[PDB]
Specification:
Two copies of one chain form a homodimer.
Chain A (H helix, E strand, L loop, with lengths): L6 E4 L8 E5 L10 E6 L11 E3 L5 E4 L10 E10 L9 E8 L7 E2 L3 E7 L7 E4 L2 E2 L13 E8 L8 E3 L5 E4 L11 E9 L7 E11 L1
Parallel strand pairs in A: 1-7, 9-16
Antiparallel strand pairs in A: 2-5, 3-6, 4-5, 6-7, 8-11, 10-14, 12-15, 13-14, 15-16
Bound molecules: calcium ion (4 copies).
The site of one calcium ion has 7 residues of chain B, from loops.
Organism (chains A, B): Homo sapiens (Human)
Subunit structure (chains A, B): Interacts with CDCP1 and CTNNB1.
Function (chains A, B): Cadherins are calcium-dependent cell adhesion proteins. They preferentially interact with themselves in a homophilic manner in connecting cells; cadherins may thus contribute to the sorting of heterogeneous cell types.
Chain lengths: ~210, ~210
């Protein structure tokens, strides 16, 4: 049977609301006044009244901005009832697919990570791994894709930047010589993660590296 | 049965084209690859290729601006064929209703109308009727509704304006005393018609009034 195709609605819409999405119609409206209604989560059960249908035009409406990170898909049913009170169609499946926008900034899993490394490991040696998440989508867009970086080091001894970070994995490595527990037992690195793989909004944290004897 | 509701498309659209209108879908696409096509005037017969359907997505498309005054409605059919070459649905009726914009200026039925009136008819006496048409719609909007007016009179004897016009009917009447064949045997009135019932674009003509002895 011919059905309504899933309907794609970008999240965080600006309206105006209510917003027309699709017009339901039974062709038995040749003969009878028909009353359209809708059921399902989003309509008559939680969250109620996100969608509605105009009972005489059949126009399915969306009444407010959506948010993919709360609900990504809605499964509704459309119904058609004669003026006399008989349902004149099997309920129609309607699907609403909510599409991603970049409405979330990245968030580090901790404000402060802690790792350690031996003085005198060769340059290129992995030290620790840091991690940030993004609620948005990483499969079809870069809204959820994170770019790791290092904003600065303290102290700047012996060199101004002694560590680097893998922009995808967040592994921090040593890139310099001169680590020396006795001279400088600890470094504090301000670390940053940016969504859109670098083009987006940024968040910040720190990583503390103990220099092992 | 649940069908596609007639689809309203304002004429003279600015695109971009091709433009998505509606997404056809057979639910037998669970089991089989389905190929969508469309027939009817506007699709596979004249004017051909105004509409099209993407054979695998089912997306009905409009490929160029429409014009209500050439074609106000299109009746198409949608079809669904399995990869194996069987049609798996009765063809679906699709209707496209083209909605009016004010794309036509008014046009007088003649460049020059001719009428006559006796000197010394009382003020208020009907003289002649002029007529303009507008292709646009007069039922739901004022795009086709015309406002008649008089831009000027020649000669300006004895008074500057001796005639008036019914802003709806275009009947010209005498509003002054002093008509006199011997003094002034003829007047030439520049007449105007404006759509949007006065707020629109204007066209111009003349009416020649013979003054009868
Ligand atoms: Ca994001
Ligand atoms: Ca998002
Ligand atoms: Ca017009
Ligand atoms: Ca028009």
């Amino acid at each position: 049977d011919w059905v309504v195709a899933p309907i794609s609605v970008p999240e965080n819409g600006e309206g105006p609301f209510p917003q027309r999405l699709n017009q339901l119609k039974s062709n038995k409206d040749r003969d009878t006044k028909i009353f359209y209604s809708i059921t399902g989560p989003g309509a008559d059960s939680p969250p109620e009244g996100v969608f509605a249908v105009e009972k005489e035009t059949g126009w399915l409406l969306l009444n407010k901005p959506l948010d993919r990170e709360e609900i990504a898909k809605y499964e509704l049913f459309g119904h058609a009832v004669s003026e006399n009170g008989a349902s004149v169609e099997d309920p129609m499946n309607i699907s609403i697919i909510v599409t991603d926008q970049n409405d979330h900034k990245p968030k580090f899993t901790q404000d402060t990570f802690r790792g350690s490394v031996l003085e005198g490991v060769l340059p290129g040696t992995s030290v620790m791994q840091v991690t940030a998440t993004d609620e948005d989508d990483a499969i079809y867009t870069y809204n959820g894709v994170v770019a790791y970086s290092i904003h600065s080091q303290e102290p700047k001894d012996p060199h101004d930047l002694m560590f680097t970070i893998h922009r995808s994995t967040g592994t921090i490595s040593v890139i310099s010589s001169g680590l020396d527990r006795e001279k400088v037992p600890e470094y504090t690195l301000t670390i940053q993660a940016t969504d859109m793989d670098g083009d987006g909004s940024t968040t910040t944290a720190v990583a503390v590296v103990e220099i092992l004897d």
